[PDB]
Design an enzyme around this catalytic site. Sequence first.
Site, short mmCIF file in Angstrom:
data_model
loop_
_atom_site.label_atom_id
_atom_site.label_comp_id
_atom_site.label_asym_id
_atom_site.label_seq_id
_atom_site.Cartn_x
_atom_site.Cartn_y
_atom_site.Cartn_z
N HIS A 12 0.73 -1.26 0.00
CA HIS A 12 0.00 0.00 0.00
C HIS A 12 0.75 1.28 0.00
CE1 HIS A 12 -3.51 -2.34 0.50
NE2 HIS A 12 -3.07 -3.05 1.52
N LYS A 41 -4.97 -10.15 -7.77
CA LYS A 41 -5.64 -9.62 -6.55
C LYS A 41 -6.69 -8.65 -7.11
CE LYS A 41 -4.47 -7.44 -2.08
NZ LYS A 41 -4.67 -5.96 -2.00
C1 LIG Z 1 -3.56 -4.35 1.96
C2 LIG Z 1 -4.52 -4.48 3.10
O1 LIG Z 1 -4.45 -3.78 4.13
N1 LIG Z 1 -5.46 -5.43 3.02
C3 LIG Z 1 -6.27 -5.61 4.25
C4 LIG Z 1 -7.57 -4.79 4.24
C5 LIG Z 1 -8.57 -5.61 5.11
N2 LIG Z 1 -8.78 -5.17 6.59
C6 LIG Z 1 -8.30 -5.91 7.70
C7 LIG Z 1 -8.54 -5.47 8.99
C8 LIG Z 1 -8.00 -6.25 10.21
C9 LIG Z 1 -9.30 -4.26 9.25
O2 LIG Z 1 -9.55 -3.81 10.36
N3 LIG Z 1 -9.77 -3.61 8.12
C10 LIG Z 1 -9.53 -4.03 6.80
O3 LIG Z 1 -9.97 -3.43 5.84
O4 LIG Z 1 -7.99 -6.95 5.19
C11 LIG Z 1 -6.73 -7.02 4.41
C12 LIG Z 1 -5.77 -7.92 5.20
O5 LIG Z 1 -6.48 -9.08 5.63
#
Ligand SMILES: *CC(=O)N[C@H]1C[C@H](n2cc(C)c(=O)[nH]c2=O)O[C@@H]1CO
Lengths: 124, 124
Positions: A12, A41
């Site tokens: 990111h 992805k």
């Molecule tokens: C690149 C990335 O951060 N993917 C994440 C987004 C999503 N996520 C996980 C958690 C724990 C949260 O509180 N909010 C989110 O949007 O899951 C991906 C990783 O599992």
Amino acid sequence: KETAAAKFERQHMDSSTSAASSSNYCNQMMKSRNLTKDRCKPVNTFVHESLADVQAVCSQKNVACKNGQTNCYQSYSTMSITDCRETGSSKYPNCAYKTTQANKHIIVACEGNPYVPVHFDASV
Amino acid sequence: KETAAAKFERQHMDSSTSAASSSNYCNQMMKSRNLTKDRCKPVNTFVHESLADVQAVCSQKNVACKNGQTNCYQSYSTMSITDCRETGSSKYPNCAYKTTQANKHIIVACEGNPYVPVHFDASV
Ligand SMILES: *CC(=O)N[C@H]1C[C@H](n2cc(C)c(=O)[nH]c2=O)O[C@@H]1CO
Ligand SMILES: *CC(=O)N[C@H]1C[C@H](n2cc(C)c(=O)[nH]c2=O)O[C@@H]1CO
């Protein structure tokens, strides 16, 4: 073998650019970041700000994450981001994405000591 | 026994208004649409467009959904949306939200016969 924080950076962060260069930005980045490795992805957002500026969000506005837990933080200011979304046509291994550049608030999940971003929750 | 279509209208459509009235829009709407009944739903988006305009998105830009399915579509034009995000001080039953009004493209998941929106994927 990557820490959660290192993973967040790989997936990111794109501090090297102010904004998504062209229409091909996502096709290039998803691949070079290893997000098209075993499969395409489907969605990913890159933040175009310094790491320190993004780490600072962990002490900004506290909000609920998508899962209902409150280790999420919303940036005070808008940040330059690029949204990458897999298109209808996309076919592994020639993964195809739509590139959207915007200025939005970010919301991240934070963890550890120091308390740094480990997940990208949403942009608003 | 609520239909997927009717559940999408109840949780994500607000055709009666052009935009979030006040800062209090989310606190009021999350409660009236029953999204705070047993718990505080943490995030929700309301679209301020006619049903006809939202159903039409099912024939616009095909993209992958968050889950990898390919029955997602992005509106070509921006639409009036309201983002609801649970704040860090919200405690059930006094669910508290932050209201964000914006003009953004929407991404919906479509299914059935007739082919209509049944899930809200994201705004871009
Ligand atoms: C690149 C990335 O951060 N993917 C994440 C987004 C999503 N996520 C996980 C958690 C724990 C949260 O509180 N909010 C989110 O949007 O899951 C991906 C990783 O599992
Ligand atoms: C009100 C609503 O749409 N909630 C959705 C958001 C999310 N979702 C589901 C599917 C199947 C999809 O393709 N994309 C999404 O973003 O989960 C809820 C469904 O219970």
